[PDB]
Amino acid sequence: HWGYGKHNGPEHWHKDFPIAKGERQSPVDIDTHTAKYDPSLKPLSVSYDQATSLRILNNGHAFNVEFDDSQDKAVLKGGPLDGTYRLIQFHFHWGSLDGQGSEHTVDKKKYAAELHLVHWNTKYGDFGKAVQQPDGLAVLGIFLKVGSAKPGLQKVVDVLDSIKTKGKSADFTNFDPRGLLPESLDYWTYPGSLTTPPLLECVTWIVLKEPISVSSEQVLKFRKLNFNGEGEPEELMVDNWRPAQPLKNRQIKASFK
Ligand SMILES: *CCS(=O)(=O)c1c(F)c(F)c(S(N)(=O)=O)c(F)c1NC1CCCCCCC1
Ligand SMILES: [Zn+2]
């Protein structure tokens, strides 16, 4: 099926998913000199005090921390967004080495990894309906650089050995995603897509300028996960990122001057 291997990677996805060559594909390069400050944008509102984590899952292409989204408990509002978007999960993309891993780039710079906090527009009732809409999802993207350890990440790192292989899950309650945020919420925003099949063009992207720092040891443990299922030959889960896609007829806006 599709993946990030030698023969089923991003350059092949268009054969099953023709929207791969569409008009609003993600990720993109963020050219910092061309992004225009938009004084009409509002400050982001991140309300995660009531977030309730449930489970961590190895789904074969990343690991997901899933939240209880049966109520408005953890929501993203404001900035470019109209209405209320509810947190459903977060996951990461990372590299085989520190010089690559992110999906978005900044002046062509690649970070070691990229965190995505996925939210769905509650006016559409469920996420399945939301992904059929141009304003169905809001994904908050946060770059990871290697330096000092991120203490709020270690609980995630420590459970990864329990979900090594595709299809494994573990209980993962009481995790606070506010521990993964940088200091500043300054951001770039643009209309785009999911970065994995089915590549639906349903996302407002909000990509924070400030990266978080994680340690070498923390990211090394991401790279011990497996794409394969238990009992199959080991394929390390590394380089699960899609490269930058053409910007086409889109403008990237900055929240900051
Ligand atoms: C392949 C599913 S995933 O790992 O959960 C997943 C992913 F890898 C992604 F890269 C995106 S992204 N970058 O576009 O944000 C993503 F949204 C993923 N999962 C969502 C689940 C949330 C419900 C909406 C349905 C879209 C897939
Ligand atoms: Zn993602």
Author numbering: 4 to 125, 127 to 261
What does the literature reporting this entry say, word for word?
The 20 contains cyclooctylamine substitution at the meta position, exhibiting a high affinity for purified CAIX. The crystal structures of compounds 21, 20, and 23 with CAI, CAII, and CAIX, respectively, showed covalent bond formation between the ligands and the histidine residue of the enzymes. In CAI, the ligand forms a covalent bond with His 67, while in CAII and CAIX, the bond is made with His 64 – a residue responsible for proton shuttle function in CA isoforms. The distance between the nitrogen atom of histidine and the vinyl carbon atom of the compounds was around 1.5 Å, consistent with the length of the covalent bond, and was visible with strong electron density in all three crystal structures. The tail moiety of the ligands is also coordinated by two hydrogen bonds – with Asn 62 and Gln 92 (CAII numbering) in the cases of CAII and CAIX, while in CAI, a possible hydrogen bond is formed with Gln 92 and His 64. Electron density was overall good for the whole ligand in all three crystal structures, with slightly weaker electron density observed in the hydrophobic tail region indicating higher flexibility. The hydrophobic tail part is oriented towards the active site region, which varies most between CA isozymes (the so-called ‘hot spot’ for isozyme (isoform)-selective inhibitor design Alterio et al., 2009). The covalent tag-bearing vinyl-sulfonyl warhead showed better results compared to bromoacetazolamide (>90% of compound covalently bound to bovine CAII after 10 hr at pH 7.4). The compounds 20 and 12 irreversibly bound and inhibited most of the human CA isoforms in less than 2 hr (at pH 7.0) and possibly are the first covalent CA inhibitors tested against CA isozymes, except the above-described inhibitors of CAII and CAI, with vinyl-sulfonyl reacting with the histidine residue.
